[PDB]
Design a protein around this nucleic acid. Structure first.
Length: 52
RNA sequence: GUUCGCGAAAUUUUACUUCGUGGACAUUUGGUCAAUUUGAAACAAUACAGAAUCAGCAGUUCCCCUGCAUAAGGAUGAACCGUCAAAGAGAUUUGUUUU
């Protein structure tokens, strides 16, 4: 019961929005070849997951 | 003066009676049942020391095991890639192998 109420509580963590930070943090990477398909998949996934 | 013991006499050895002899030879206290009875104050009633035991759970304090929550923190896997929708008006082009 506490486990399910936790998820019904998680949805309120979903509809919470931004509250923009102060300083954005940036990194720059550079590569010779992106052709590897799984790398191309992971860079998309992990970008969507972390809200990067 | 009281008793116990030994020796002598009068009678039937122990016994009574008397002489010579060795001890022992104080009284009290520390001894109240408590409780209850309308009277010039006594111990007379009225009781009468009879004036509960086995077992179960839980709760505080620490420890371990296993869950779920929460705060932080990490490790890894997931094949395919992003600068609109509708309607209206104007401008340009368009004989035989795969229908």
């Amino acid at each position: 019961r506490r486990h399910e109420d936790a998820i019904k509580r998680r949805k309120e963590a979903v509809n919470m929005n931004v509250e923009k930070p102060t300083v954005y943090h940036c990194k720059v990477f550079q590569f010779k070849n992106l052709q590897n398909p799984k790398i191309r998949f992971k860079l998309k996934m992990n970008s969507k997951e972390l809200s990067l």
